Design a protein around this ligand. Structure first.
Ligand code: HEM
Ligand code: HEM
Ligand code: HEM
Ligand code: HEM
Lengths: 141, 146, 141, 146
């Protein structure tokens, strides 16, 4: 449901993210764990304190996946198929949690992109993360 | 919750007709079939590969009885759910790591099972009363998460 | 995605529903208004008293649309196109409400279909109503 | 709502830097742009067709200031949000017919606007405090719905 303007907006914002994408993915996770503590139930094996290398390492994996989704924005189901299988059949994260991480990624981008996070780009990023979430939960049942 | 007295009476009168072990096995089984990601806590229970296997799995049955027996006992304390379920809330957060969304899903599945079991007796006002109860139980189970 | 077996299950259950589809649609709405009173904010122009002609009429319209979706389950976007436009552009019902009506339609079906509402059919009906809800909210932004 | 002293402290310190005029218009305008179905309540506000028209619309700006000014007076009563907002809750239900899901959406957009305005000062702990407050305000505004 991403229009050409949406795709343009997402590629422009994420390109400014650039090599900080991993830092920002870690910050989004930290924001999520503090704001929405029920999400911590999926990570009992992690040290979730501030600065944790486990959170940093996971934030980089999440960010890299989003980088791959931007790059494959017209073929996201295939580019994300292994991650959809992983979340549907192994990790089995309740779909509600994807809205929570999405909101925390938008807050992170807002806090780091003063100039780029205009109302139109905010709308396009929110639609893009909803579409990513949809793909990742598409095989749950 | 805050049920009016006639809502409380509605809830209690129906529950008196429930076979708790039966409905508990049915509700937990249907949770695992309808929302299969909820199976993630139950890898130790054996074969969950088809809906027939789930529904007939004796360990799903046995956990369903345990869950619904604690629910049943909570119906005696509709004025004090947060208090009745505080220790179980802590347990489900700190030791079992159960996302509280699962309690909301179970509540909706339980309402469907009661409708299935009671048919026309599960009227719209009786459903509304049970919806307040299952929301209050989910809220109480989620209250000590941190 | 609706599997072939899901489609089989939905067609059988709905076929059982048959000529009662309008009555069940009206019951599902009444269940929604009572259980989830915030949904009444979309009907302030209706008499919502039990048995009102407006609710019975609206119930039949909802049921006929579901009948259309069941008949065209392999092309729902196309089939429900007008309705998705109507909800997206005119009615503008917040997407959360679709989950509430879906739940109340499942309860109504459970209460009337003792023989047919098996665990597998319940699963398939839940997925079907989520898919219809997704199509109806697909053009919101 | 219960906030720790470092959370209430954080909420207060940041809000003293907020120009309610300007943040209120940014937050309401972004709600209308990002979740355009919320425009259903604002048919008389004129031109809302493009993000640029929404954001520059003086009636959006004026209403945003009203809404955030009332939100502001709620920060002065964090321990009884329900009694603070009861009159407005009844208004929004009985006269305005606003689905309370909209209050949750505005809360989340407001958090994004604070993050945009304040940048690195809006740290993860400060956000978590604000998320509890906006959830508390949404729940308070929804409380008299029936
Ligand atoms: C934008 C949405 C998300 C993206 C792109 C994504 C991406 C990923 C990636 C790339 C991996 C590592 C797969 C690896 O080992 O190969 C992973 C693992 C995992 N994800 Fe997701 N994820 C998303 C949302 C969620 C959410 C919402 C949760 C739960 C709150 C979650 C929980 C987990 C868990 C528990 C792991 C395994 C962590 C480990 O053990 O190391 N994911 N995800
Ligand atoms: C009405 C809601 C619920 C009630 C009242 C409840 C009650 C209970 C009770 C009484 C126990 C035994 C704790 C003790 O042994 O000291 C328990 C255990 C457990 N519960 Fe919950 N429960 C609910 C929902 C759920 C849900 C929806 C899930 C997950 C999908 C879940 C997962 C578990 C797990 C994994 C155990 C440990 C079982 C064992 O070790 O064998 N519970 N629950
Ligand atoms: C299974 C999901 C749904 C179906 C299939 C559906 C279908 C319909 C149809 C067929 C119409 C009449 C269209 C016409 O007369 O031009 C309509 C109208 C309407 N719907 Fe939806 N709907 C669904 C969900 C919802 C929800 C969740 C709400 C709100 C809680 C909602 C609120 C409305 C309103 C307010 C009207 C206009 C009623 C009027 O004034 O007559 N719908 N819907
Ligand atoms: C923090 C949440 C909110 C607070 C504190 C709040 C407070 C207020 C206040 C003070 C009024 C002015 C009432 C007057 O001068 O009679 C008002 C009116 C109104 N509000 Fe809310 N509001 C909130 C959220 C929302 C949302 C999210 C929507 C819908 C998307 C909404 C829709 C309206 C409408 C339609 C009016 C009437 C505007 C008019 O007079 O055309 N409000 N609100």
């Amino acid at each position: 449901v991403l229009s050409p303007a949406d795709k343009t907006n997402v590629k422009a914002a994420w390109g400014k993210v650039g090599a900080h994408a991993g830092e920002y993915g870690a910050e989004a996770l930290e924001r999520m764990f503090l704001s929405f503590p029920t999400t911590k139930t999926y990570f009992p094996h992690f040290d979730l304190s501030h600065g944790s290398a486990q959170v940093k390492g996971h934030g980089k994996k999440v960010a890299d996946a989003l980088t791959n989704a931007v790059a494959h924005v017209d073929d996201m189901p295939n580019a994300l198929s292994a991650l959809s299988d992983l979340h549907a059949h192994k990790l089995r994260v309740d779909p509600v949690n994807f809205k929570l991480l999405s909101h925390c990624l938008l807050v992170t981008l807002a806090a780091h992109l003063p100039a780029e996070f205009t109302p139109a780009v905010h709308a396009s990023l929110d639609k893009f993360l909803a579409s990513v979430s949809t793909v990742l939960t598409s095989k749950y049942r | 919750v805050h049920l009016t007295p006639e809502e409380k009476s509605a809830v209690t009168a129906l529950w008196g007709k429930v076979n708790v072990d039966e409905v508990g096995g049915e509700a937990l089984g249907r949770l695992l079939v309808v929302y299969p990601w909820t199976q993630r806590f139950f890898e130790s229970f054996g074969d969950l590969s088809t809906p027939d296997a789930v529904m007939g799995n004796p360990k799903v049955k046995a956990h369903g009885k345990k869950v619904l027996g604690a629910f049943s006992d909570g119906l005696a304390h509709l004025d004090n759910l947060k208090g009745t379920f505080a220790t179980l809330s802590e347990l489900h957060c700190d030791k079992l790591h159960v996302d509280p969304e699962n309690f909301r899903l179970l509540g909706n599945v339980l309402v469907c099972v009661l409708a299935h079991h009671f048919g026309k007796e599960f009227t719209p006002p009786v459903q509304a009363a049970y919806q307040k109860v299952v929301a209050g139980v989910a809220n109480a189970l989620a209250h000590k998460y941190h």
